[PDB]
Design a protein around this ligand. Structure first.
Ligand SMILES: CCCCCCCC
Length: 225
C-alpha cells in the first residue's frame, strides 16, 4: 500500500562557525513523504519540506569577557532564515518477522538555506541513504526508529558581497516515532540531526569559507494516511 505522511517539527537549532555561534528561535518545519511500492519489496520514496527560523549571532564565551576586561562588539539579532529540502529515491523493504519490517533506501536530494542581514545562501545537491525499522506493539500501536546519512556531491556557498564557492560536506539524522492507528495514523517522536560543511579551498584578497557545523534537536509530529 502507498503511504503518505504530512509532518511538522518543533526544534532547537544551533550552529558554530569560526569564533561564533548562531542560535535559532522559532525554528519550524513542515514536510511531506510518499512511500510508493512497486512490488512486494521495491518502491520509491519522495520527500519535500520547508523550514524557517530567526537566528542570533553570538560570540563564544571567554574568561576575559566574564571578567570585564574585554567587550564583544554587537552582532546581528533576529536574522531570518528559510530552508527547503527535496528527496527522490529507491527503497527496498522486507519483513524481519510478522511484527517487524525493515526498510532501506538511497537517492538524490537537494537542500537550500538563505538568510538576510547581506544575503548568504547554501545550496546543496546530495546523495542520501536511509534505514528504518517498523515494529508493531499491538492494538494499532507501533515504534519506528530511523536513521539517514547525507553526502554532498556539489554544495555551494553564496554571498551577495559576489561569492560562490563549493563547500561539500555531510550530515546524519536519527530518531524514533511512536504511532497509533486511528482506524490513518498519528505519530510523534524525537529526532537529532547534524550537518557539517567543510572549510572551502582558498579563493581570491585570499579567503576561505569557514567550516560550519549545525546541530538540531526536535520533536516531529505526523499524520500518516
Ligand atoms: C533512537 C534515536 C532517538 C533520537 C534521540 C535524539 C535525542 C533527542
Amino acid at each position: 500500500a502507498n503511504e503518505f505522511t504530512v509532518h511538522t517539527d518543533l526544534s532547537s537549532i544551533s550552529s558554530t562557525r569560526a569564533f561564533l555561534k548562531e542560535k535559532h528561535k522559532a525554528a519550524k518545519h513542515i514536510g511531506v513523504r510518499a512511500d510508493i511500492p512497486f512490488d512486494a519489496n521495491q518502491g520509491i520514496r519522495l520527500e519535500a519540506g520547508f523550514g524557517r527560523s530567526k537566528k542570533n549571532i553570538i560570540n563564544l564565551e571567554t574568561d576575559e569577557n566574564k571578567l570585564g576586561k574585554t567587550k564583544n562588539v554587537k552582532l546581528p539579532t533576529g536574522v531570518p532564515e528559510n530552508r527547503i529540502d527535496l528527496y527522490t529515491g529507491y527503497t527496498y523493504t522486507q519483513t524481519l518477522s510478522d511484527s517487524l519490517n525493515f526498510r532501506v533506501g538511497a537517492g538524490l536530494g537537494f537542500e537550500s538555506s538563505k538568510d538576510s542581514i547581506l544575503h548568504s545562501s547554501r545550496q546543496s545537491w546530495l546523495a542520501k541513504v536511509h534505514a528504518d525499522l517498523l515494529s508493531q506493539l499491538g492494538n494499532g500501536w507501533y515504534i519506528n526508529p530511523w536513521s539517514e546519512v547525507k553526502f554532498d556531491l556539489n554544495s555551494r556557498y553564496k554571498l551577495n558581497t559576489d561569492i560562490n564557492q563549493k563547500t561539500n560536506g555531510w550530515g546524519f539524522g536519527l530518531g524514533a516515532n511512536i504511532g497509533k492507528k486511528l482506524g490513518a495514523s498519528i505519530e510523534a517522536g524525537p529526532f537529532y540531526k547534524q550537518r557539517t560543511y567543510k572549510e572551502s579551498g582558498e579563493f581570491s584578497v585570499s579567503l576561505t569559507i569557514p567550516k560550519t557545523s549545525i546541530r538540531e534537536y526536535g520533536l516531529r509530529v505526523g499524520i500518516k494516511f
